[PDB]
Amino acid sequence: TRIAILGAGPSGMAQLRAFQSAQEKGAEIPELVCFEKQADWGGQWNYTWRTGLDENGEPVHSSMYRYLWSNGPKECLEFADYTFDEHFGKPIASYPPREVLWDYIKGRVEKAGVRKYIRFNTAVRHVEFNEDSQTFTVTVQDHTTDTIYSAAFDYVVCCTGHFSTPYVPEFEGFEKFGGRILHAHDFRDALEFKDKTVLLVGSSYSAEDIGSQCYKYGAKKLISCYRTAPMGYKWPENWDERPNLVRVDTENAYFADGSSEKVDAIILCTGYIHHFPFLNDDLRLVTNNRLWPLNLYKGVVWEDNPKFFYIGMQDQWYSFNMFDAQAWYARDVIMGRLPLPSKEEMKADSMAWREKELTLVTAEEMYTYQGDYIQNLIDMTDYPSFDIPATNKTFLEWKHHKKENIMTFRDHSYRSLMTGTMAPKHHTPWIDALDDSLEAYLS
Amino acid sequence: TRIAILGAGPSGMAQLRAFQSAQEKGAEIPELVCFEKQADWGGQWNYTWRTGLDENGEPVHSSMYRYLWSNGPKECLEFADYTFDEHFGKPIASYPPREVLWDYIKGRVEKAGVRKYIRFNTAVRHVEFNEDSQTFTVTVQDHTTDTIYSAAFDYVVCCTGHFSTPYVPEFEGFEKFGGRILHAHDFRDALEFKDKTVLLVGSSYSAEDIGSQCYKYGAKKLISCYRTAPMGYKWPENWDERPNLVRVDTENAYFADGSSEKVDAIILCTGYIHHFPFLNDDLRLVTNNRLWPLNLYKGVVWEDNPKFFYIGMQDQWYSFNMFDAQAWYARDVIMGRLPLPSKEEMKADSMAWREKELTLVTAEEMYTYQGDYIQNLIDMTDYPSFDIPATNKTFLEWKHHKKENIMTFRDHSYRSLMTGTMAPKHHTPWIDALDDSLEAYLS
Ligand SMILES: Cc1cc2nc3c(=O)[nH]c(=O)nc-3n(C[C@H](O)[C@H](O)[C@H](O)COP(=O)(O)OP(=O)(O)OC[C@H]3O[C@@H](n4cnc5c(N)ncnc54)[C@H](O)[C@@H]3O)c2cc1C
Ligand SMILES: Cc1cc2nc3c(=O)[nH]c(=O)nc-3n(C[C@H](O)[C@H](O)[C@H](O)COP(=O)(O)OP(=O)(O)OC[C@H]3O[C@@H](n4cnc5c(N)ncnc54)[C@H](O)[C@@H]3O)c2cc1C
Ligand SMILES: NC(=O)c1ccc[n+]([C@@H]2O[C@H](COP(=O)([O-])OP(=O)(O)OC[C@H]3O[C@@H](n4cnc5c(N)ncnc54)[C@H](OP(=O)(O)O)[C@@H]3O)[C@@H](O)[C@H]2O)c1
Ligand SMILES: NC(=O)c1ccc[n+]([C@@H]2O[C@H](COP(=O)([O-])OP(=O)(O)OC[C@H]3O[C@@H](n4cnc5c(N)ncnc54)[C@H](OP(=O)(O)O)[C@@H]3O)[C@@H](O)[C@H]2O)c1
Ligand SMILES: [Cl-]
Ligand SMILES: [Cl-]
């Protein structure tokens, strides 16, 4: 019996780690093959200067940029089976830069010895399910050998992420505008916008952080514009929030204010779409970005074909943590440890979760909900229980530190829920920490 | 009997025109379905401000930019069945802007009434050939309905182009550089580089023209770097050619000169790759960009499966013209008018064309070769013969005007080979024609 794992970001890495853990405790595991289009693992966390399409012509995956740091508390994404203490050997602050968390997630799978299951530089083209043999044919392109080939699997776990294919709306006059227009997905070095005026269309995490990054590295002026409601924070002197963009000139932007501004560049921070070009409608998840997509029993088993799974397709307050709980659950169903109920029962269960999701009003209610979801998963499994209510509270602190001051939220510290140890303050306040390297953060 | 045409650029447009022409002369034609991922026809010639991935997540197709004009004589790409005189009603100059040639190619297919065969906003996912039924299954995603479906065809003609998926080599230090790095494919408005220093990596048509465009719209400084040999032309005061880039700094570029320069942005003009993600190895053309790719009988019939065709996959001195000769040939084989020889004979014929291709040294020998190729095609077909040697000579003039002065080559005029009428001088010299619109060019 044979499993295909699509992708080697945190989620695929988690899926390999789950099986390896079960084998380490003496269980007999299926054969595993994992396909990844990049040359190395880490998903989003593997930085690249590339843009649009990669060296092989596949859409560039990572949306990450220079100077990116964790945007939530480290301790809200710690692995229950592999702690920050184990990995780094010393305590570190709470909002590590990209390279540091990349080093961290690699460390777990390095220790586990699961690299050997991965075929890198290989893009998944198609997954078909055969009624007759009751198996999946996965067709891939190996860009090392420039060969296209297919292989047969009994179950498939899709871990290809949903923050990679941009949602890019059009505004009137974009075809006339003289400056750069880009989506957040293409943002790389904040220095390219030094001494320039940047319009940021959108009001979520990308808007906040890309603006923050441009501010930090010396842009002249920043303008956020919002669709429904204002971001709400106290922005520095050279950053305004305006109602939505309506049109654009050779050099100006016009808003629902009636106001006007000369603008050098426009960065669309409008989010992403769930896009699976390697799947037909029988297997293909269709959803907007939300806490409870439909058709996923326990949020991971595909209801129209329960031998196909999805990891991490929910919107994210929790992350690494959650993928783990998902991957452990996926594995125990694949291994026959947790038999699936009937299709009617699955659908009724998923309806209950959707009813509750539509109930949610406040940030607190939302991550508490994801908290409840994760709790339900970890209770069914091998995976070590940890203090979820206490993680929720850590989120609550985090939200407060953002309300207090949006530029200084990364200068606070929190208690690890795995080890119990309060994180130290970092050696340099965020505003002044211009060097984003692992090197400089750990020294 | 039923045909699938993949793409509605010049080539797919030509393929539909070919069939329509045969029906207009009273022949019974097959059913035609043409699939196009954009919302309108024209291929490269349909401009978009978009970059990387389009509103549906498909790779953005067009490589074209603001202010692009024909880079060869108009009269070298005139349709033999639909003249510039017929379309515009007046004589026009010889290097029309993008919008003008777009208007022109649309005109032929507007007159022909072939739009009705096209499914726009539909991306081709996969083409399989079935041994049992001797037919092709084409799977597509309709982004209007968000549905994925498949349909059966007896022959397939692939017209998806080969100047869209960038070849993007890496140079040391790109992950440290502070400015924008982009491939020519992502170049949009030359105004974004006003008063800046731009490095152009490459030594072909994109290098020449993107530099030219940046110069024309007010860049501070330009640097071309070449892999094998220098471009050769006399560049204006603020533009140097130096040997290849070796590495890059936070803000500087270093060359095999040993020389150094502060640089604001890097535009890789390093060309494209043949990429067909919708095809398996049984159907998939693998080739570098050249005058005579292998495995294409008469340069269009796929030798391992002669019910599958390729249009326009050769490198291009001729263009529109050539696609016509190819499409007319494809059609006459599909229609049984020109029976295919045996596989051995096809391979031997292709070998002879390859032998000759490797003989070619000079620009003149090269386009004369493609001229001979086109001649061989049009003699086998319905398609009106026209003076190819005289078109060759028009290319020769064109090359001379480029050697004379690379910035003024677009200010010359040539004799139409269809109508025989010398083109008038344009109303504004190229350097001063800042407005790129159809509107402004025809007034
Ligand atoms: C800019 C940005 C910043 C973020 N910052 C944080 C943060 O600070 N903290 C946090 O908790 N979360 C953050 N996230 C959320 C992020 O989704 C998770 O941290 C995590 O990366 C999810 O991992 P994943 O493996 O499920 O998806 P991904 O990390 O996207 O991995 C998907 C993998 O699948 C591969 N793949 C996709 N298609 C194919 C194909 N056809 N064939 C082969 N391989 C394929 C990709 O190469 C990739 O490796 C951020 C997300 C973005 C976009
Ligand atoms: C920047 C640039 C400038 C150029 N300038 C000139 C010039 O001045 N003069 C000249 O003679 N030639 C020029 N060319 C050469 C150009 O190749 C031809 O002029 C002509 O555009 C080739 O047409 P085509 O139909 O064969 O390919 P394309 O024009 O590229 O059309 C291919 C079509 O297939 C579609 N497609 C691709 N994949 C899919 C899919 N999977 N599903 C559905 N549809 C798909 C695309 O949307 C596109 O419409 C230029 C090329 C480039 C890149
Ligand atoms: N580590 C980091 O610092 C960091 C940085 C960036 C991103 N990320 C991660 O990336 C993920 C997504 O971040 P995200 O903000 O890009 O996606 P997102 O959370 O879905 O944000 C979507 C935003 O786009 C806006 N939008 C959509 N259409 C619009 C339109 N037509 N006009 C104006 N606005 C429009 C939405 O407006 P409405 O609110 O009105 O619907 C919303 O503000 C998150 O997990 C986040 O953690 C992390
Ligand atoms: N209408 C217009 O004005 C216009 C503008 C742009 C493009 N186009 C069209 O687009 C098509 C392609 O033009 P193109 O120039 O982008 O593709 P191209 O003609 O294949 O040019 C390829 C170039 O990339 C260079 N290159 C490849 N790898 C390199 C490396 N590692 N380092 C440095 N240089 C490298 C090659 O160097 P080598 O020479 O050593 O091999 C060559 O100079 C042509 O049909 C052209 O008509 C038209
Ligand atoms: Cl272990
Ligand atoms: Cl007609």
Side-chain angles (χ1 to χ4, degrees), chain A residues 419-431:
Chain A
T419 63
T421 44
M422 181 60 67
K425 199 166 276 149
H426 188 49
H427 59 60
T428 310
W430 178 87
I431 185 80

PDB file of all heavy atoms in Angstrom, chain A residues 419-431:
ATOM      1  N   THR A 419       7.137  24.030  26.800  1.00  0.00           N
ATOM      2  CA  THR A 419       8.232  23.976  27.775  1.00  0.00           C
ATOM      3  C   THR A 419       7.965  24.796  29.024  1.00  0.00           C
ATOM      4  O   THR A 419       8.605  24.580  30.048  1.00  0.00           O
ATOM      5  CB  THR A 419       9.535  24.534  27.188  1.00  0.00           C
ATOM      6  OG1 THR A 419       9.356  25.926  26.867  1.00  0.00           O
ATOM      7  CG2 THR A 419       9.960  23.752  25.942  1.00  0.00           C
ATOM      8  N   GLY A 420       7.063  25.767  28.925  1.00  0.00           N
ATOM      9  CA  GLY A 420       6.683  26.593  30.074  1.00  0.00           C
ATOM     10  C   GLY A 420       7.574  27.800  30.311  1.00  0.00           C
ATOM     11  O   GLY A 420       7.364  28.550  31.265  1.00  0.00           O
ATOM     12  N   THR A 421       8.555  28.006  29.434  1.00  0.00           N
ATOM     13  CA  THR A 421       9.561  29.052  29.662  1.00  0.00           C
ATOM     14  C   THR A 421       9.315  30.371  28.908  1.00  0.00           C
ATOM     15  O   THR A 421       9.216  30.376  27.675  1.00  0.00           O
ATOM     16  CB  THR A 421      10.986  28.530  29.365  1.00  0.00           C
ATOM     17  OG1 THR A 421      10.977  27.772  28.143  1.00  0.00           O
ATOM     18  CG2 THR A 421      11.483  27.647  30.538  1.00  0.00           C
ATOM     19  N   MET A 422       9.232  31.473  29.667  1.00  0.00           N
ATOM     20  CA  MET A 422       9.067  32.814  29.100  1.00  0.00           C
ATOM     21  C   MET A 422      10.215  33.147  28.155  1.00  0.00           C
ATOM     22  O   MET A 422      11.364  32.965  28.506  1.00  0.00           O
ATOM     23  CB  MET A 422       8.954  33.862  30.213  1.00  0.00           C
ATOM     24  CG  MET A 422       8.740  35.314  29.739  1.00  0.00           C
ATOM     25  SD  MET A 422       7.244  35.651  28.767  1.00  0.00           S
ATOM     26  CE  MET A 422       5.903  35.382  29.953  1.00  0.00           C
ATOM     27  N   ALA A 423       9.894  33.609  26.948  1.00  0.00           N
ATOM     28  CA  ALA A 423      10.903  34.036  25.975  1.00  0.00           C
ATOM     29  C   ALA A 423      11.577  35.360  26.386  1.00  0.00           C
ATOM     30  O   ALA A 423      10.931  36.238  26.947  1.00  0.00           O
ATOM     31  CB  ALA A 423      10.279  34.151  24.598  1.00  0.00           C
ATOM     32  N   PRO A 424      12.885  35.502  26.113  1.00  0.00           N
ATOM     33  CA  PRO A 424      13.589  36.733  26.444  1.00  0.00           C
ATOM     34  C   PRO A 424      13.244  37.837  25.446  1.00  0.00           C
ATOM     35  O   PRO A 424      12.757  37.539  24.361  1.00  0.00           O
ATOM     36  CB  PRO A 424      15.057  36.333  26.271  1.00  0.00           C
ATOM     37  CG  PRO A 424      15.035  35.308  25.187  1.00  0.00           C
ATOM     38  CD  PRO A 424      13.776  34.520  25.463  1.00  0.00           C
ATOM     39  N   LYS A 425      13.499  39.095  25.805  1.00  0.00           N
ATOM     40  CA  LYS A 425      13.462  40.183  24.829  1.00  0.00           C
ATOM     41  C   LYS A 425      14.577  40.011  23.778  1.00  0.00           C
ATOM     42  O   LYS A 425      15.643  39.475  24.072  1.00  0.00           O
ATOM     43  CB  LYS A 425      13.593  41.531  25.536  1.00  0.00           C
ATOM     44  CG  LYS A 425      13.108  42.722  24.692  1.00  0.00           C
ATOM     45  CD  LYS A 425      12.929  44.011  25.517  1.00  0.00           C
ATOM     46  CE  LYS A 425      11.553  44.053  26.211  1.00  0.00           C
ATOM     47  NZ  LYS A 425      11.598  44.803  27.525  1.00  0.00           N
ATOM     48  N   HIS A 426      14.330  40.438  22.548  1.00  0.00           N
ATOM     49  CA  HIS A 426      15.360  40.347  21.512  1.00  0.00           C
ATOM     50  C   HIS A 426      16.414  41.437  21.732  1.00  0.00           C
ATOM     51  O   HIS A 426      16.152  42.421  22.431  1.00  0.00           O
ATOM     52  CB  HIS A 426      14.734  40.438  20.109  1.00  0.00           C
ATOM     53  CG  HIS A 426      15.699  40.165  18.992  1.00  0.00           C
ATOM     54  ND1 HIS A 426      16.528  39.062  18.975  1.00  0.00           N
ATOM     55  CD2 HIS A 426      15.959  40.851  17.849  1.00  0.00           C
ATOM     56  CE1 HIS A 426      17.262  39.086  17.876  1.00  0.00           C
ATOM     57  NE2 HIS A 426      16.936  40.159  17.174  1.00  0.00           N
ATOM     58  N   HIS A 427      17.595  41.271  21.141  1.00  0.00           N
ATOM     59  CA  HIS A 427      18.691  42.232  21.337  1.00  0.00           C
ATOM     60  C   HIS A 427      18.538  43.590  20.618  1.00  0.00           C
ATOM     61  O   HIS A 427      19.213  44.560  20.966  1.00  0.00           O
ATOM     62  CB  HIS A 427      20.048  41.591  20.994  1.00  0.00           C
ATOM     63  CG  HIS A 427      20.157  41.090  19.583  1.00  0.00           C
ATOM     64  ND1 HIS A 427      20.017  41.911  18.481  1.00  0.00           N
ATOM     65  CD2 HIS A 427      20.443  39.857  19.098  1.00  0.00           C
ATOM     66  CE1 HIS A 427      20.193  41.202  17.379  1.00  0.00           C
ATOM     67  NE2 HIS A 427      20.454  39.952  17.725  1.00  0.00           N
ATOM     68  N   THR A 428      17.664  43.651  19.616  1.00  0.00           N
ATOM     69  CA  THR A 428      17.444  44.871  18.843  1.00  0.00           C
ATOM     70  C   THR A 428      15.956  45.040  18.619  1.00  0.00           C
ATOM     71  O   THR A 428      15.302  44.096  18.176  1.00  0.00           O
ATOM     72  CB  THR A 428      18.133  44.811  17.459  1.00  0.00           C
ATOM     73  OG1 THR A 428      19.498  44.401  17.603  1.00  0.00           O
ATOM     74  CG2 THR A 428      18.092  46.167  16.780  1.00  0.00           C
ATOM     75  N   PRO A 429      15.405  46.235  18.933  1.00  0.00           N
ATOM     76  CA  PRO A 429      13.998  46.510  18.608  1.00  0.00           C
ATOM     77  C   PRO A 429      13.733  46.382  17.109  1.00  0.00           C
ATOM     78  O   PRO A 429      14.626  46.639  16.301  1.00  0.00           O
ATOM     79  CB  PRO A 429      13.793  47.960  19.074  1.00  0.00           C
ATOM     80  CG  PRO A 429      15.175  48.531  19.239  1.00  0.00           C
ATOM     81  CD  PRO A 429      16.043  47.376  19.616  1.00  0.00           C
ATOM     82  N   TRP A 430      12.509  45.992  16.761  1.00  0.00           N
ATOM     83  CA  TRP A 430      12.146  45.642  15.377  1.00  0.00           C
ATOM     84  C   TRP A 430      12.477  46.735  14.376  1.00  0.00           C
ATOM     85  O   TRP A 430      13.020  46.454  13.309  1.00  0.00           O
ATOM     86  CB  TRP A 430      10.668  45.231  15.262  1.00  0.00           C
ATOM     87  CG  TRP A 430      10.228  44.914  13.840  1.00  0.00           C
ATOM     88  CD1 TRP A 430      10.322  43.714  13.199  1.00  0.00           C
ATOM     89  CD2 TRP A 430       9.640  45.819  12.894  1.00  0.00           C
ATOM     90  NE1 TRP A 430       9.833  43.814  11.919  1.00  0.00           N
ATOM     91  CE2 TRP A 430       9.411  45.095  11.705  1.00  0.00           C
ATOM     92  CE3 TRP A 430       9.287  47.175  12.935  1.00  0.00           C
ATOM     93  CZ2 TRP A 430       8.835  45.676  10.572  1.00  0.00           C
ATOM     94  CZ3 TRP A 430       8.716  47.751  11.800  1.00  0.00           C
ATOM     95  CH2 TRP A 430       8.494  46.999  10.638  1.00  0.00           C
ATOM     96  N   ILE A 431      12.159  47.973  14.725  1.00  0.00           N
ATOM     97  CA  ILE A 431      12.330  49.099  13.811  1.00  0.00           C
ATOM     98  C   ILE A 431      13.783  49.255  13.347  1.00  0.00           C
ATOM     99  O   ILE A 431      14.036  49.709  12.231  1.00  0.00           O
ATOM    100  CB  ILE A 431      11.774  50.427  14.421  1.00  0.00           C
ATOM    101  CG1 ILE A 431      11.852  51.582  13.419  1.00  0.00           C
ATOM    102  CG2 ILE A 431      12.478  50.794  15.722  1.00  0.00           C
ATOM    103  CD1 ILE A 431      10.742  51.584  12.393  1.00  0.00           C
TER     104      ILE A 431
END
